[PDB]
Design a protein around this ligand. Structure first.
Ligand SMILES: O=C(O)c1cccc(-c2ccc3[nH]ccc3c2)c1
Length: 242
């Protein structure tokens, strides 16, 4: 069951932007969105792909655990936090592309393609360079398809070990207080038009879970903070978080 609530469009319009927010109430098995066409439009996943990439690397032994250190290659890049050592947790927190490109190269085309099909992930198409296909290749995924995948991850139903899914869910931890827990991943797609930002994940409450997936036009890096700000406003409006 799905419900469209165009009143939420104000959260994007007021910032001279456009996007979609999709919510899923797990207890009630009901969905909500401001825009239902865009909810089903497929975009590059960009750094939201670090989730499936982490799951595959762990299950194949490319990553031993969340403590294994991945040494900086000594190449200075324009993101300061990337020019240092990382483990799965910090590479995830700072969306460290070069670490995950190496994950992909060791995974390889065959295993990556097979596991994205087993995940039923997006259009399951890895056409392009194995170390960049989620940034400028043919893979595509929608917000509603992001939800479907995250729900399986939450329930440990993806076709990898329970251990692998617990570790990635730990790495996704974003916010925790006495009222809620958020596990999520950001994305920022710029190599193919239209440029967008992602935020996908879920909110853990005492007796329910709310999955969310949002994307929004992002012509400049100046609006990246709106990915989280807009989503949280919707959650507040719907009285999901205070
Ligand atoms: O998905 C993210 O939230 C993310 C995480 C880490 C870095 C960036 C990012 C990339 C290019 C940029 N150019 C100017 C600013 C800027 C920021 C985005």
């Amino acid at each position: 069951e799905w419900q469209e609530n165009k009143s939420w469009n104000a959260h994007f319009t007021e910032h001279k932007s456009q996007g979609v927010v999709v919510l899923w109430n797990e207890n009630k098995q009901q969905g909500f969105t401001n825009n239902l066409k865009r909810a089903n439009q497929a975009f590059l996943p960009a750094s939201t792909f670090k989730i499936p990439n982490s799951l595959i690397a762990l299950d194949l032994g490319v990553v031993k655990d969340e403590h294994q250190v991945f040494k900086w290659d000594g190449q200075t890049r324009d993101i300061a936090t990337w020019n240092r050592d990382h483990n799965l947790i910090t590479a995830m927190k700072y969306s460290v592309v070069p670490v995950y490109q190496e994950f992909a190269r060791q995974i390889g085309e065959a295993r990556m393609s097979k596991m994205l099909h087993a995940f039923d992930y997006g259009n399951e198409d890895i056409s392009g360079n194995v170390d960049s296909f989620w940034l400028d290749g043919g893979i595509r995924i929608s917000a509603t398809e992001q939800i479907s995948f995250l729900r399986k991850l939450y329930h440990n139903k993806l076709h990898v070990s329970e251990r692998s899914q617990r570790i990635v869910k730990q790495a996704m931890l974003t916010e925790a207080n006495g009222d809620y827990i958020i596990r999520a991943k950001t994305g920022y797609s710029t190599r193919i038009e239209p440029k967008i930002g992602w935020w996908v994940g879920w909110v853990e409450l005492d007796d329910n879970v709310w999955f969310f997936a949002m994307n929004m036009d992002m012509p400049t890096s100046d609006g990246l903070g709106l990915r989280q700000a807009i989503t949280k406003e919707v959650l507040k409006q719907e009285k999901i978080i205070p």
